[PDB]
Design an enzyme around this catalytic site. Structure first.
Site, PDB file in Angstrom:
ATOM      1  N   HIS A 249      -9.970   2.831 -10.988  1.00  0.00           N
ATOM      2  CA  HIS A 249      -9.540   3.690  -9.888  1.00  0.00           C
ATOM      3  C   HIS A 249      -8.073   4.102 -10.051  1.00  0.00           C
ATOM      4  N   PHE A 250      -7.175   3.122  -9.993  1.00  0.00           N
ATOM      5  CA  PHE A 250      -5.748   3.426  -9.836  1.00  0.00           C
ATOM      6  C   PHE A 250      -5.014   4.083 -11.035  1.00  0.00           C
ATOM      7  N   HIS A 251      -5.557   3.943 -12.245  1.00  0.00           N
ATOM      8  CA  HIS A 251      -5.088   4.743 -13.365  1.00  0.00           C
ATOM      9  C   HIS A 251      -5.265   6.233 -13.154  1.00  0.00           C
TER      10      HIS A 251
ATOM     11  N   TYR B 147       1.834   5.528  -1.972  1.00  0.00           N
ATOM     12  CA  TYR B 147       2.201   6.850  -1.448  1.00  0.00           C
ATOM     13  C   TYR B 147       3.682   7.206  -1.782  1.00  0.00           C
TER      14      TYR B 147
ATOM     15  N   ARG C 174     -10.938  -7.813 -13.288  1.00  0.00           N
ATOM     16  CA  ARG C 174      -9.622  -7.326 -13.648  1.00  0.00           C
ATOM     17  C   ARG C 174      -8.617  -8.461 -14.062  1.00  0.00           C
ATOM     18  N   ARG C 175      -7.502  -8.047 -14.651  1.00  0.00           N
ATOM     19  CA  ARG C 175      -6.442  -9.004 -15.019  1.00  0.00           C
ATOM     20  C   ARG C 175      -6.897 -10.132 -15.979  1.00  0.00           C
TER      21      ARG C 175
ATOM     22  N   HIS D  40       0.767  -1.243   0.000  1.00  0.00           N
ATOM     23  CA  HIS D  40       0.000   0.000   0.000  1.00  0.00           C
ATOM     24  C   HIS D  40       0.796   1.290   0.000  1.00  0.00           C
TER      25      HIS D  40
HETATM   26  C1  HAS Z   1      -0.255   6.612  -6.551  1.00  0.00           C
HETATM   27  C2  HAS Z   1      -1.422   5.658  -6.541  1.00  0.00           C
HETATM   28  C3  HAS Z   1      -2.304   5.417  -5.594  1.00  0.00           C
HETATM   29  C4  HAS Z   1      -2.829   6.243  -4.471  1.00  0.00           C
HETATM   30  C5  HAS Z   1      -2.667   7.747  -4.316  1.00  0.00           C
HETATM   31  C6  HAS Z   1      -3.747   5.498  -3.819  1.00  0.00           C
HETATM   32  C7  HAS Z   1      -4.776   6.110  -2.930  1.00  0.00           C
HETATM   33  C8  HAS Z   1      -5.797   5.503  -2.358  1.00  0.00           C
HETATM   34  N1  HAS Z   1      -5.985   4.179  -2.425  1.00  0.00           N
HETATM   35 FE1  HAS Z   1      -5.439   2.969  -3.922  1.00  0.00          FE
HETATM   36  N2  HAS Z   1      -6.712   1.563  -3.298  1.00  0.00           N
HETATM   37  C9  HAS Z   1      -7.210   1.492  -1.930  1.00  0.00           C
HETATM   38  C10 HAS Z   1      -7.139   2.704  -1.068  1.00  0.00           C
HETATM   39  C11 HAS Z   1      -6.940   3.907  -1.535  1.00  0.00           C
HETATM   40  C12 HAS Z   1      -7.494   5.135  -0.914  1.00  0.00           C
HETATM   41  C13 HAS Z   1      -8.429   5.205   0.277  1.00  0.00           C
HETATM   42  C14 HAS Z   1      -6.706   6.135  -1.335  1.00  0.00           C
HETATM   43  C15 HAS Z   1      -6.633   7.513  -0.700  1.00  0.00           C
HETATM   44  O1  HAS Z   1      -5.265   7.840  -0.606  1.00  0.00           O
HETATM   45  C16 HAS Z   1      -7.377   8.633  -1.449  1.00  0.00           C
HETATM   46  C17 HAS Z   1      -7.085  10.083  -1.014  1.00  0.00           C
HETATM   47  C18 HAS Z   1      -7.281  11.175  -2.039  1.00  0.00           C
HETATM   48  C19 HAS Z   1      -8.331  11.994  -2.160  1.00  0.00           C
HETATM   49  C20 HAS Z   1      -9.465  12.119  -1.180  1.00  0.00           C
HETATM   50  C21 HAS Z   1      -8.475  12.895  -3.376  1.00  0.00           C
HETATM   51  C22 HAS Z   1      -8.434  14.386  -3.073  1.00  0.00           C
HETATM   52  C23 HAS Z   1      -8.183  15.128  -4.365  1.00  0.00           C
HETATM   53  C24 HAS Z   1      -7.109  15.889  -4.611  1.00  0.00           C
HETATM   54  C25 HAS Z   1      -5.872  15.995  -3.700  1.00  0.00           C
HETATM   55  C26 HAS Z   1      -7.085  16.696  -5.874  1.00  0.00           C
HETATM   56  C27 HAS Z   1      -7.768  18.015  -5.698  1.00  0.00           C
HETATM   57  C28 HAS Z   1      -7.741  18.752  -7.019  1.00  0.00           C
HETATM   58  C29 HAS Z   1      -7.381  20.014  -7.129  1.00  0.00           C
HETATM   59  C30 HAS Z   1      -6.910  20.799  -5.910  1.00  0.00           C
HETATM   60  C31 HAS Z   1      -7.449  20.643  -8.515  1.00  0.00           C
HETATM   61  C32 HAS Z   1      -7.788  22.141  -8.634  1.00  0.00           C
HETATM   62  C33 HAS Z   1      -7.558  22.601 -10.050  1.00  0.00           C
HETATM   63  C34 HAS Z   1      -8.347  23.409 -10.744  1.00  0.00           C
HETATM   64  C35 HAS Z   1      -8.075  23.809 -12.170  1.00  0.00           C
HETATM   65  C36 HAS Z   1      -9.570  24.039 -10.175  1.00  0.00           C
HETATM   66  C37 HAS Z   1      -7.785   0.122  -1.640  1.00  0.00           C
HETATM   67  C38 HAS Z   1      -8.685  -0.240  -0.505  1.00  0.00           C
HETATM   68  O2  HAS Z   1      -8.693   0.263   0.605  1.00  0.00           O
HETATM   69  C39 HAS Z   1      -7.504  -0.669  -2.671  1.00  0.00           C
HETATM   70  C40 HAS Z   1      -7.745  -2.154  -2.768  1.00  0.00           C
HETATM   71  C41 HAS Z   1      -9.173  -2.547  -3.169  1.00  0.00           C
HETATM   72  C42 HAS Z   1      -9.145  -3.754  -4.077  1.00  0.00           C
HETATM   73  O3  HAS Z   1     -10.023  -4.738  -3.875  1.00  0.00           O
HETATM   74  O4  HAS Z   1      -8.318  -3.767  -4.986  1.00  0.00           O
HETATM   75  C43 HAS Z   1      -6.680   0.135  -3.612  1.00  0.00           C
HETATM   76  C44 HAS Z   1      -5.851  -0.392  -4.714  1.00  0.00           C
HETATM   77  C45 HAS Z   1      -5.156   0.356  -5.537  1.00  0.00           C
HETATM   78  C46 HAS Z   1      -4.235  -0.315  -6.484  1.00  0.00           C
HETATM   79  C47 HAS Z   1      -4.339  -1.737  -6.920  1.00  0.00           C
HETATM   80  C48 HAS Z   1      -3.341  -2.646  -6.235  1.00  0.00           C
HETATM   81  C49 HAS Z   1      -3.447  -3.970  -6.932  1.00  0.00           C
HETATM   82  O5  HAS Z   1      -2.880  -4.069  -8.016  1.00  0.00           O
HETATM   83  O6  HAS Z   1      -4.154  -4.944  -6.359  1.00  0.00           O
HETATM   84  C50 HAS Z   1      -3.201   0.459  -6.656  1.00  0.00           C
HETATM   85  C51 HAS Z   1      -2.227   0.381  -7.812  1.00  0.00           C
HETATM   86  C52 HAS Z   1      -3.573   1.734  -5.964  1.00  0.00           C
HETATM   87  C53 HAS Z   1      -3.061   2.926  -6.333  1.00  0.00           C
HETATM   88  C54 HAS Z   1      -3.130   4.192  -5.494  1.00  0.00           C
HETATM   89  N3  HAS Z   1      -4.014   4.317  -4.375  1.00  0.00           N
HETATM   90  N4  HAS Z   1      -4.782   1.642  -5.341  1.00  0.00           N
HETATM   91  C1  HEM Z   2      -0.502   3.995 -22.099  1.00  0.00           C
HETATM   92  C2  HEM Z   2      -1.663   4.242 -21.170  1.00  0.00           C
HETATM   93  C3  HEM Z   2      -2.089   3.203 -20.462  1.00  0.00           C
HETATM   94  C4  HEM Z   2      -3.193   2.248 -20.753  1.00  0.00           C
HETATM   95  C5  HEM Z   2      -4.274   2.424 -21.795  1.00  0.00           C
HETATM   96  C6  HEM Z   2      -3.357   1.559 -19.660  1.00  0.00           C
HETATM   97  C7  HEM Z   2      -4.489   0.605 -19.550  1.00  0.00           C
HETATM   98  C8  HEM Z   2      -4.440  -0.341 -18.643  1.00  0.00           C
HETATM   99  C9  HEM Z   2      -5.470  -1.419 -18.515  1.00  0.00           C
HETATM  100  C10 HEM Z   2      -6.514  -1.713 -19.601  1.00  0.00           C
HETATM  101  C11 HEM Z   2      -5.125  -2.217 -17.497  1.00  0.00           C
HETATM  102  C12 HEM Z   2      -5.954  -3.260 -16.799  1.00  0.00           C
HETATM  103  C13 HEM Z   2      -5.824  -4.524 -17.657  1.00  0.00           C
HETATM  104  C14 HEM Z   2      -6.417  -5.755 -16.966  1.00  0.00           C
HETATM  105  O1  HEM Z   2      -7.030  -5.581 -15.780  1.00  0.00           O
HETATM  106  O2  HEM Z   2      -6.360  -6.894 -17.484  1.00  0.00           O
HETATM  107  C15 HEM Z   2      -3.875  -1.639 -16.934  1.00  0.00           C
HETATM  108  C16 HEM Z   2      -3.306  -2.083 -15.626  1.00  0.00           C
HETATM  109  C17 HEM Z   2      -2.226  -1.611 -15.091  1.00  0.00           C
HETATM  110  N1  HEM Z   2      -1.867  -0.337 -15.206  1.00  0.00           N
HETATM  111 FE1  HEM Z   2      -1.987   0.595 -17.010  1.00  0.00          FE
HETATM  112  N2  HEM Z   2      -2.298   1.700 -18.845  1.00  0.00           N
HETATM  113  C18 HEM Z   2      -1.457   2.655 -19.255  1.00  0.00           C
HETATM  114  C19 HEM Z   2      -0.426   3.242 -18.674  1.00  0.00           C
HETATM  115  C20 HEM Z   2      -0.090   3.006 -17.252  1.00  0.00           C
HETATM  116  C21 HEM Z   2       0.784   3.751 -16.549  1.00  0.00           C
HETATM  117  C22 HEM Z   2       1.553   5.018 -17.008  1.00  0.00           C
HETATM  118  C23 HEM Z   2       0.754   3.118 -15.201  1.00  0.00           C
HETATM  119  C24 HEM Z   2       1.733   3.300 -14.077  1.00  0.00           C
HETATM  120  C25 HEM Z   2       2.510   4.336 -13.900  1.00  0.00           C
HETATM  121  C26 HEM Z   2      -0.002   2.025 -15.370  1.00  0.00           C
HETATM  122  C27 HEM Z   2       0.137   0.771 -14.539  1.00  0.00           C
HETATM  123  C28 HEM Z   2      -0.825  -0.148 -14.388  1.00  0.00           C
HETATM  124  C29 HEM Z   2      -0.747  -1.320 -13.471  1.00  0.00           C
HETATM  125  C30 HEM Z   2      -0.283  -1.153 -12.038  1.00  0.00           C
HETATM  126  C31 HEM Z   2      -1.547  -2.273 -13.950  1.00  0.00           C
HETATM  127  C32 HEM Z   2      -2.167  -3.397 -13.138  1.00  0.00           C
HETATM  128  C33 HEM Z   2      -1.515  -4.755 -13.487  1.00  0.00           C
HETATM  129  C34 HEM Z   2      -2.013  -5.963 -12.670  1.00  0.00           C
HETATM  130  O3  HEM Z   2      -3.171  -5.967 -12.028  1.00  0.00           O
HETATM  131  O4  HEM Z   2      -1.355  -6.981 -12.551  1.00  0.00           O
HETATM  132  N3  HEM Z   2      -0.784   2.175 -16.458  1.00  0.00           N
HETATM  133  N4  HEM Z   2      -3.467  -0.548 -17.761  1.00  0.00           N
HETATM  134  O1  LIG Z   3      -2.730   1.416  -3.473  1.00  0.00           O
HETATM  135  O2  LIG Z   3      -3.677   2.269  -2.742  1.00  0.00           O
END
Ligand code: HAS
Ligand code: HEM
Ligand SMILES: [O-][O-]
Ligand SMILES: CCCCCCCC/C=C\CCCCCCCC(=O)OC[C@H](O)CO
Ligand SMILES: CCCCCCCC/C=C\CCCCCCCC(=O)OC[C@H](O)CO
Ligand SMILES: CCCCCCCC/C=C\CCCCCCCC(=O)OC[C@H](O)CO
Ligand SMILES: CCCCCCCC/C=C\CCCCCCCC(=O)OC[C@H](O)CO
Ligand SMILES: CCCCCCCC/C=C\CCCCCCCC(=O)OC[C@H](O)CO
Ligand SMILES: CCCCCCCC/C=C\CCCCCCCC(=O)OC[C@H](O)CO
Ligand SMILES: CCCCCCCC/C=C\CCCCCCCC(=O)OC[C@H](O)CO
Ligand SMILES: CCCCCCCC/C=C\CCCCCCCC(=O)OC[C@H](O)CO
Ligand SMILES: CCCCCCCC/C=C\CCCCCCCC(=O)OC[C@H](O)CO
Ligand SMILES: CCCCCCCC/C=C\CCCCCCCC(=O)OC[C@H](O)CO
Ligand SMILES: CCCCCCCC/C=C\CCCCCCCC(=O)OC[C@H](O)CO
Ligand SMILES: CCCCCCCC/C=C\CCCCCCCC(=O)OC[C@H](O)CO
Ligand SMILES: CCCCCCCC/C=C\CCCCCCCC(=O)OC[C@H](O)CO
Ligand SMILES: CCCCCCCC/C=C\CCCCCCCC(=O)OC[C@H](O)CO
Ligand SMILES: CCCCCCCC/C=C\CCCCCCCC(=O)OC[C@H](O)CO
Ligand code: CUA
Lengths: 31, 166, 554
Positions: free
Chosen positions: C376-378, C229, C441-442, C225
């Site tokens: 979500h994670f994209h 971050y 997924r996957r 996890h």
């Molecule tokens: C860098 C990437 C990642 C971050 C950040 C991250 C954040 C969260 N995650 Fe996540 N996620 C989970 C919990 C969360 C929650 C609660 C947050 C929190 O950190 C969210 C906090 C953020 C916010 C509340 C957003 C606030 C918005 C902001 C800060 C932007 C404001 C915009 C502005 C200011 C723009 C203004 C501009 C103008 C022009 C007006 C959980 C479960 O509890 C799962 C597992 C569930 C499952 O069955 O797979 C999960 C699984 C994933 C996976 C899949 C892992 C796998 O392959 O199995 C990955 C890659 C991942 C990525 C990331 N995750 N997440």
């Molecule tokens: C070129 C744009 C991108 C496309 C269209 C794209 C699309 C996707 C899709 C369709 C999947 C899910 C496939 C599946 O569940 O079978 C996937 C998963 C993935 N994406 Fe990407 N992706 C791109 C770029 C990236 C980038 C820049 C990140 C990371 C920096 C990223 C990392 C991941 C990871 C973590 C997996 C999950 C693999 C797994 O579950 O084993 N994506 N992408």
């Molecule tokens: O990975 O949240």
């Protein structure tokens, strides 16, 4: 007052809120 | 101006920080609520229950799928599921509606999903562990089970079937 | 040049960047075909004729995951959270270690790449046992990751050298960020290193017959996890301490920014179970716990949203924007290095809201392992992190090479960044919606094309995002090579300073600032929070091991 910031966090709140209630509903439908 | 903006920013920042605290807590209460109803049966039993993947198709309740279903209650059935590459035994699973179903699933190989389509049953199945979840099918018919954890080349064509009898 | 003799940190940093982006180009190739796949369209025959070492959707899926989410992100982290702190402090990183870490990173990368490219480790970037990769995959990954411990050390070094020449001063902002960053990463990483040393490696070398899958999963998600971050926080450094500058304004508060980072250090690691919600043999009272602590680690980001948004608003007001939307139009949208992050900031709204859902224990059984997760994670990593890394090209590269960016070159960047954003939005609609229709997924769903008829609609998004993100990617390749291989230099670009932002002038909390500077202390507490949150479960798991044969099913 930073009414722009507040707008943002408004969109942010709404978004979370639609997501969370949305999926909660669904959980109960599939319950 | 610059010494003001800061005050107003920080003044409202503080509102928001506590409003968000609030909303996040309401969720915690809303999640706790679900933990207390029947919808919570799908949460895995957190107890360790270790079997042996190499013999589980030879001895024990996974070895004869035609008997994998058991009335363990007045209105309760335990069902023994084997998930493996690539399918589920038995096929189909047969339970009655309205009956509380205690699914005890495991694998002989690699890990598998056990996601029952149309319902909350979504559980990982680890070889050597038995996963216990509990559901009551409220509508009769045919639910499909999808494997939602990568298991290898046949991952995508691995499905089981559940039949809920009227 | 003479520039690299005073600032050798420049060179090493450059390498960490270039390598990462290469890894991203390669990792990303696989994307579009996976987008088409999730739109029920099978373009893999084409891909196999263009990339014949590729035997399956799943080998691709491994390559994609490992290279984009592990390699590139990590090299980006290393470039950002070493060079940035060191430039602010204006002291030189130990150039001995700084190169050792590059060579490790690269050496390991290449070792791991061998079994990956040879279809000997099609296990995905989770590599769940009992699916059994080649030893070279595990050693190679291990050596790749560990390189980061060398970075941890480099910065703590800088920091303490600065704290020496400057006793009784607070830690500088960017440097305070990098320090808690790396410390956090340290606690975070033990999970994986533990699973690697006690399990993955002996097993992949044949020293033991099988591994216990549940312990492995628990230990993996310990690291699993916070690594997320670890991906994000380099971008937040930039969002917080650089973006306000190039937006036309300032950082509205230094103390809020420290607070956010600090919170991360303490709440990034004790939350792993939120990935194990459907795991057996892990007590529910522990899951409710990590659920609640997960909701807490949302807080710094909730904080971050406002802080950054107010900072952007203020920059907007500064440049004449008046109204409620006016300040938005006032911001420098001709500048890609401004656009790329703010766009990722938009995607992060839905993304985080996706995260909040996933964290909610029981709700997770609606979405777990379905196409919602990747949807979500994209929005998080492959948009907000990536988009940030991308727009950095247009300020960090001249800073590191003296190679200037043409006007032409800047207009190409805007294209890329927007197209990438737009594509990641479209994909985000297609995936989420599909996961709600219970699509896994996957999975190479395109090969069971009659399996998910209920999802024709979301599938059209997937295909569209597929082609849209193919266009963007090609552009990014073309462009990144226009600069990298550019024919003209300007040593005064290299010499100019990083566009670090000023902090808005208003009084603050010396007292909190001061509190938060007690880093030795906070480090401990984060660690205690980890003993306490993972201790009991792990102790009982180790109590009752049950290892199982491995399997190669591909
Ligand atoms: C860098 C990437 C990642 C971050 C950040 C991250 C954040 C969260 N995650 Fe996540 N996620 C989970 C919990 C969360 C929650 C609660 C947050 C929190 O950190 C969210 C906090 C953020 C916010 C509340 C957003 C606030 C918005 C902001 C800060 C932007 C404001 C915009 C502005 C200011 C723009 C203004 C501009 C103008 C022009 C007006 C959980 C479960 O509890 C799962 C597992 C569930 C499952 O069955 O797979 C999960 C699984 C994933 C996976 C899949 C892992 C796998 O392959 O199995 C990955 C890659 C991942 C990525 C990331 N995750 N997440
Ligand atoms: C070129 C744009 C991108 C496309 C269209 C794209 C699309 C996707 C899709 C369709 C999947 C899910 C496939 C599946 O569940 O079978 C996937 C998963 C993935 N994406 Fe990407 N992706 C791109 C770029 C990236 C980038 C820049 C990140 C990371 C920096 C990223 C990392 C991941 C990871 C973590 C997996 C999950 C693999 C797994 O579950 O084993 N994506 N992408
Ligand atoms: O990975 O949240
Ligand atoms: C930054 C931008 C923020 C983006 C977030 C948008 C928020 C919610 C989108 C909701 C879309 C519609 C929700 C679906 C509800 C619906 O139509 O329900 C289906 C019906 O139940 C059939 O079974
Ligand atoms: C990024 C793009 C985000 C797309 C999805 C956004 C929000 C999902 C919210 C869930 C919407 C579905 C709610 C369904 C509902 O209303 O639940 C009862 C129904 O009976 C159940 O089958
Ligand atoms: C479930 C209910 C649906 C709700 C949907 C909308 C929610 C409102 C969103 C954000 C407000 C957060 C910021 C609150 C700011 C309050 C005022 C404050 O703290 O500022 C006073 C200032 O100090 C004077 O000088
Ligand atoms: C100062 C103001 C303080 C008040 C702030 C709170 C505002 C509303 C929040 C939560 C309500 C939680 C209600 C809990 C009941 C859940 C019932 C439910 O939704 O479940 C129905 C389901 O069909 C049965 O099986
Ligand atoms: C912008 C994003 C928009 C997103 C919009 C997404 C719509 C979500 C739809 C359904 C969720 C829950 C449906 C629950 C599954 C029902 C299956 C069912 O009823 O069948 C079971 C049984 O076999 C009978 O015999
Ligand atoms: C395996 C060997 C790794 C060989 C790597 C060569 C190290 C070269 C390097 O980057 O170090 C500079 C050194 O001081 C030279 O001038
Ligand atoms: C340092 C470079 C190489 C270390 C040598 C590592 C080579 C270790 C050999 C392990 C091996 O070949 O074992 C395969 C077996 O099938 C597994 O279960
Ligand atoms: C870093 C690379 C890991 C290699 C060796 C570390 C120590 C390995 C020590 C060998 C442990 C295996 C053992 O003692 O035997 C287990 C066997 O299954 C019971 O009969
Ligand atoms: C800030 C950290 C606070 C951490 C503690 C907050 C309160 C959670 C305690 C117990 C949850 C009870 C969970 C019971 C769920 C079991 C359901 C079951 O029995 O499954 C079938
Ligand atoms: C789903 C598919 C659709 C995806 C769309 C989602 C949101 C897209 C962009 C938000 C950006 C809003 C602000 C854009 C600012 C540009 C601007 O204000 O510039 C005008 C002019 O060039 C002088 O700056
Ligand atoms: C119906 C929807 C179908 C989606 C079609 C997808 C993309 C269209 C091309 C969009 C290209 C966007 C580029 C915007 C840009 O480059 O913006 C510069 C600007 O001045 C401020 O940043
Ligand atoms: C953001 C930019 C717009 C993207 C896509 C348009 C959506 C078109 C959706 C229309 C349905 C397409 C389809 O395939 O129809 C379903 C089914 O086949 C019926 O028989
Ligand atoms: C310049 C901007 C152009 C942007 C267009 C706006 C988005 C609409 C459609 C894109 C269509 C992309 C995919 C086209 C084929 C759809 C498909 O695969 O169809 C499945 C069908 O429903 C099963 O038979
Ligand atoms: C940046 C990218 C720019 C945005 C481009 C959007 C896609 C273009 C659509 C034009 C119309 C598509 C119509 C022809 C394709 C659909 C079709 O004919 O069928 C698909 C086939 O069945 C499957 O192999
Ligand atoms: C190394 C892990 C903890 C670092 C904090 C620490 O011990 O800080 C004291 C520092 O040497 C005084 O400036
Ligand atoms: Cu069995 Cu995927």
């Amino acid at each position: 007052k930073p009414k722009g910031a507040l707008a943002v966090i408004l969109v942010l709140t709404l978004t979370i809120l639609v997501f969370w209630l949305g999926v909660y509903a669904v959980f109960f439908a599939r319950g | 101006d610059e010494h003001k903006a800061h005050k107003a920013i920080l003044a409202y920042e503080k509102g928001w920080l506590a409003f968000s605290l609030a909303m996040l807590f309401v969720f915690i209460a809303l999640i706790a609520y679900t933990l207390a109803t029947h919808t919570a049966g799908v949460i895995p039993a957190g107890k360790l229950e270790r079997v042996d993947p190499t013999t589980v198709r030879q001895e024990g309740p996974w070895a004869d799928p035609a008997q994998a279903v058991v009335q363990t209650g007045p209105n309760q059935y335990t069902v023994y599921v084997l998930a493996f590459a690539f399918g589920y035994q038995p096929n189909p699973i047969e339970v009655p509606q309205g009956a509380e179903i205690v699914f005890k699933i495991t694998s002989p190989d690699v890990i598998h999903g056990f996601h029952v389509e149309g319902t909350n049953i979504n559980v990982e199945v680890l070889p050597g562990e038995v996963s216990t979840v509990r559901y009551t099918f409220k509508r009769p018919g045919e639910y499909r089970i999808i494997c939602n954890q990568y298991c290898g080349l046949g991952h995508q064509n691995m499905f089981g079937t559940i039949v809920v009898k009227e | 040049s003479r520039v690299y003799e005073a600032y050798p940190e420049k060179k090493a940093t450059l390498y960490f960047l270039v390598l990462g982006f290469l890894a991203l180009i390669v990792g990303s190739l696989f994307g579009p075909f996976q987008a088409l796949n999730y739109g029920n369209v099978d373009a893999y025959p084409l891909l196999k004729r263009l990339l014949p070492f590729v035997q399956s959707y799943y080998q691709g899926l491994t390559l994609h995951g490992v290279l984009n989410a592990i390699v590139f992100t990590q090299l980006f982290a290393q470039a950002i959270m070493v060079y940035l702190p060191a430039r602010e402090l204006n002291m030189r990183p130990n150039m001995g270690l700084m190169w050792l870490s590059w060579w490790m990173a690269f050496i390991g990368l290449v070792v791991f790449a061998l079994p990956l490219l040879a279809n000997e480790a099609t296990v995905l970037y989770t590599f769940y046992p009992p699916l059994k990769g080649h030893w070279a995959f595990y050693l190679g990954a291990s050596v790749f990751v560990l390189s980061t411990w060398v970075s941890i050390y480099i910065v703590l070094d800088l920091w303490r050298r600065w704290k020496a020449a400057n006793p009784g001063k607070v830690t500088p902002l960017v440097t305070y960020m990098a320090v808690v960053f790396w410390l956090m990463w340290f606690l975070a990483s033990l999970g994986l290193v533990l699973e690697a040393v006690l399990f993955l490696l002996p097993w992949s070398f044949g020293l033991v017959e099988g591994v216990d899958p549940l312990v492995a999963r628990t230990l993996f998600w310990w690291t699993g996890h916070p690594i997320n971050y670890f991906w994000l926080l380099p971008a937040y450094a930039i969002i917080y301490t650089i973006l306000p500058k190039q937006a036309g304004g300032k950082l509205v508060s230094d103390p809020m920014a420290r607070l956010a980072f600090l919170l991360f250090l303490l709440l990034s690691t004790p939350v792993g179970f939120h990935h194990q919600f459907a795991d057996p043999g892990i007590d529910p009272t522990w899951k409710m716990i990590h659920s609640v602590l997960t909701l807490f680690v949302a807080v710094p980001s909730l904080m971050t949203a406002f802080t950054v948004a107010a900072s952007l608003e203020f920059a907007g007001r500064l440049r004449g924007g008046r109204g409620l939307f006016g300040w938005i139009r006032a911001l420098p949208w001709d500048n890609p290095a401004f656009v790329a992050p703010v766009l990722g900031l938009l995607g992060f709204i839905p993304g985080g809201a996706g995260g909040i859902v996933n964290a909610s224990f029981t709700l997770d059984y609606v979405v777990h392992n379905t196409a919602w997760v990747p949807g979500h994670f994209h929005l998080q990593v492959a948009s907000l992190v990536t988009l940030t890394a991308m727009g950095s090209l247009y300020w960090l590269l001249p800073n590191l090479t003296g190679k200037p960016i043409s006007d032409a070159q800047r207009r190409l960047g805007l294209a890329v960044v927007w197209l990438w954003f737009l594509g990641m939005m479209i994909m985000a609609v297609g995936l989420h919606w599909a996961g709600l229709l219970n699509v896994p997924r996957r999975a190479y769903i395109a090969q069971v094309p009659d399996a998910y008829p209920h999802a024709a609609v979301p599938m059209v998004f997937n295909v569209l995002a597929g082609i849209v993100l193919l266009v963007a990617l090609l552009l990014f390749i073309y462009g990144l090579f226009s600069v990298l291989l550019s024919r003209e230099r300007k040593p005064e670009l290299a010499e100019a300073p990083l566009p670090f932002a000023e902090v808005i002038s208003g009084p603050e909390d010396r007292r909190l600032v001061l509190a938060m500077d007690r880093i030795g202390f906070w480090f401990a507490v984060a660690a205690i929070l980890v003993v306490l949150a993972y201790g009991p479960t792990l102790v009982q798991l180790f109590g009752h091991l049950n290892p199982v044969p491995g399997w190669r099913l591909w």
